[PDB]
Structures are given as structure tokens and as C-alpha cells.
Amino acid sequence: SFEQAITQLFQQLSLSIPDTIEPVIGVKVGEFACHITEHPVGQILMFTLPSLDNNNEKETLLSHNIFSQDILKPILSWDEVGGHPVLWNRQPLNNLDNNSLYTQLEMLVQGAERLQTRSFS
Amino acid sequence: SFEQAITQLFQQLSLSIPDTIEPVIGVKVGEFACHITEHPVGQILMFTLPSLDNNNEKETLLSHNIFSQDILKPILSWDEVGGHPVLWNRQPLNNLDNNSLYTQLEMLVQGAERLQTSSLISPPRSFS
Numbered sequence: 544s545f546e547q548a549i550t551q552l553f554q555q556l557s558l559s560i561p562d563t564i565e566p567v568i569g570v571k572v573g574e575f576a577c578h579i580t581e582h583p584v585g586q587i588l589m590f591t592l593p594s595l596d597n598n599n600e601k602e603t604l605l606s607h608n609i610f611s612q613d614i615l616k617p618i619l620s621w622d623e624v625g626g627h628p629v630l631w632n633r634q635p636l637n638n639l640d641n642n643s644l645y646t647q648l649e650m651l652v653q654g655a656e657r658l659q660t661r662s663f664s
Numbered sequence: 665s666f667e668q669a670i671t672q673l674f675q676q677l678s679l680s681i682p683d684t685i686e687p688v689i690g691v692k693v694g695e696f697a698c699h700i701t702e703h704p705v706g707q708i709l710m711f712t713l714p715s716l717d718n719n720n721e722k723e724t725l726l727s728h729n730i731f732s733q734d735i736l737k738p739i740l741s742w743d744e745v746g747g748h749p750v751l752w753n754r755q756p757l758n759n760l761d762n763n764s765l766y767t768q769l770e771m772l773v774q775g776a777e778r779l780q781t782s783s784l785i786s787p788p789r790s791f792s
Contacts, residue, residue: 582731582733583733583734583735586735588731590731599722600722601721601722601725601742602742602744603742604722604726605725605726605740605741605742605749606741606742606743606744607741608729608739608740608741608742609741609742609743609744609750610703610709610711610739610741610750610752610754612703612704613704614704614707614754618729618731618739619726619729620726620727620728620729620730620731621722621723621724621726621727621729621730622727622730623723623727623730628726629730629731631731633731633735635756635759637759638756638758
């Protein structure tokens with residue numbers, strides 16, 4: 544059912560339907576590299592690694608996480624292993640329809656856009 | 665199906681079943697007042713307002729929100745409307761079990777207990 548979900552999603556996005564479906568699928572939407580996988584079993588998980596800013600205060604960052612009427616609104620978190628932010632959303636694979644994966648990906652990138660409101664090595 | 669959930673819950677918790685069942689139900693465990701409600705429709709939301717500390721840094725507080733295998737692991741957030749922190753979890757009202765609503769409340773409370781910092785001995789504080 545996961546393979547069917549990724550297949551259907553790639554179709555809707557006009558993406559080359561993979562004959563081989565890896566555990567973690569990748570889809571880039573502009574500057575946001577999104578990852579799609581099943582975890583835990585029966586749950587579709589999508590995450591992106593946003594680039595926050597030291598300027599943001601704790602309460603402001605935590606404000607993004609308040610619940611809303613949309614269960615797909617993404618959660619802003621931190622991965623202590625890698626040492627960087629992680630924005631993610633999740634939904635059940637049992638209760639999934641034709642616009643589901645597509646909508647979850649859209650909700651994730653919109654949440655990522657909301658986190659932005661440069662120097663490099 | 666929501667009222668059917670609050671009953672089984674209160675029953676496993678040996679609580680008095682109200683006469684009206686407000687859209688938002690309240691259950692208090694220890695020092696944590698936990699609010700329960702169906703939001704959005706079909707989803708059972710539980711939340712409590714935990715006491716935090718400037719001690720914890722932004723990365724520490726956000727690290728509590730990483731995804732894991734447990735979908736009931738609560739989320740720490742901030743409610744800018746009320747101006748306070750909110751810890752919450754949520755699960756499909758159409759997939760509950762004879763141990764789900766319970767495990768959800770337990771996960772929320774355990775999450776709040778861990779964020780709390782209590783004095784060894786609470787001193788007497790004045791007020792009006």
C-alpha cells in the first residue's frame with residue numbers, strides 16, 4: 544500500500560515512476576528537499592531539514608507546533624544526532640485517499656516556508 | 665464515538681461520568697490538569713500546560729519533538745493566543761482500542777512530568 548502510495552504520488556507529480564521503490568523516497572520542491580518513508584509501520588512520514596535562524600526565540604519556534612484543525616500541519620523539531628532542525632508531518636496509511644500524499648507534501652513545504660520570516664563555508 | 669471514548673476512559677480511571685459532557689473534558693493527574701477534546705472532528709486531542717524553565721535551550725526543547733515509532737509521543741509547543749506552553753498528543757478516534765485512550769493520557773502525563781522541575785521541598789508562597 545506504501546508502494547502504491549508513492550507510485551500514485553509520483554504519477555500526480557509527473558515524476559518517473561520507479562520500478563524499484565527504496566525505503567526512503569526523495570522529492571525536492573524548489574529549495575526544500577523532502578523525504579518520504581513509512582515509520583512506524585502503517586504511518587506515512589515526511590520530513591525536510593529546514594534552515595532556521597539564531598535570531599528566532601524559543602517561544603517563536605515552539606509556536607509553529609501548536610495543534611490546528613489540520614493533522615498534516617508539520618512539527619518543528621531537532622535531531623540531536625545530526626545537530627540540525629527537522630520539520631515533519633505524518634498520517635495513517637489505512638485512511639489515505641487520492642489527494643493524501645500530495646496534500647501531506649504540500650502541507651510540509653508550506654510549513655517549511657513559514658519557518659522563514661547568507662554566509663556559508 | 666467520542667462520548668464512548670470519554671466513558672471507557674473515565675471508567676478505567678474510576679471517575680464520575682458527567683451529566684452533559686462538555687465539548688472539552690477535564691481530567692487531572694497529580695498536579696497536571698489534562699484537557700481532552702475532539703479536534704479536528706474524528707481526532708482525539710489531549711493537552712496540558714506544562715511548567716518549563718529558561719534552563720532548557722531551544723535545541724533541547726525542540727529535540728523533544730523528533731518523530732519516533734510511537735505516534736502518541738506528545739509534542740511541546742507554544743500557544744501565542746494564550747501566551748503559554750502546551751504539550752499535546754492526538755490519535756484517530758476511529759482506531760482506538762481498549763488501551764489506546766489510556767496509553768495516550770499516560771504518554772501526555774509522563775511527558776509533562778519529565779518537563780517539570782519540582783523543588784525537594786515546596787516553600788509557602790503568599791498571594792491575595
